[PDB]
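Quick question: what would this complex look like in 3D?
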Amino acid sequence: TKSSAAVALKGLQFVTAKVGNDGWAAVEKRFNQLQVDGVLLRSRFGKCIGMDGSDEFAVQMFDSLARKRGIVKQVLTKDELKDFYEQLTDQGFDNRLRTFFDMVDKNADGRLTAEEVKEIIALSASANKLSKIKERADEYTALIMEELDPTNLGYIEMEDLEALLLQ
Amino acid sequence: TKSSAAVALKGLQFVTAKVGNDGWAAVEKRFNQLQVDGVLLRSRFGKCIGMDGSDEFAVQMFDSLARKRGIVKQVLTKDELKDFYEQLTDQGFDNRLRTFFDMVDKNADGRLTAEEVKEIIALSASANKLSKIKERADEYTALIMEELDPTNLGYIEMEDLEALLL
Ligand SMILES: [Ca+2]
Ligand SMILES: [Ca+2]
């Protein structure tokens, strides 16, 4: 239970967060921007929904949602997109657990193998460690620049790194 | 200085370590095997030098040594490769610092911007834990499994989930 229940959760929370919780007015306006002849391409699905993840993650979510609906073209109308959206913002637990399951179940057989499970466990941990690292790096950068470029050239030079290290 | 120079020190050691210091015997031998029509591909520089770190680290390193020499083709003759080897193999501080600087300096303008600096700090902090995480994942996976699939059917169902978290 203890470490396993919390690891399923970690994975759920991760997918939920990559999808995000943008309201319909923001998703629809992006649709308006992204659509061509009234239709949203598969490749723009992540951007339309306001997703956080990789391109590949966005497209795989699209296919799991399409697959579920019997949609086989790779193009969505506003009404279809809206129906994909309704599912993804239903923040109910059953609903979220369902969408997570389908997302992690890449071959859509209604089972999850050791491989599928590890896949999403690794992605989520590693993407989360990367985001954290980039916030820190950002703060370490500001400190280096603040110290080696107090006069605000917008850069530092070789000479400044020497000094920083030889000392 | 303290935390500031440690941050910069650690990026310099990360790059130094990823490059390694194989002897010429080894790298020339590897060249001979990796070479095609006399030249060595950018994509094969890492393997030839014996670096660790990512394929991306290897090609960035490559590019930085090329930029320095105005080499714009993505291929090296043996001569040229040996020259790249010689700069890399010089573990004198002056030289190591230069190589580091040029690696961080993606546009070779002799200047390091905030953006360039954030990038090696991120990478020097990131690289190592990928595998460390890939290995924690296996310990979790094969623990989710040995608990949601006690008899080892090989898979988990939605209702195994339903019951897990409810
Ligand atoms: Ca499956
Ligand atoms: Ca630069």
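Answer marked as accepted. Chain B touches chain A through 48 residues (CB under 8 Å).
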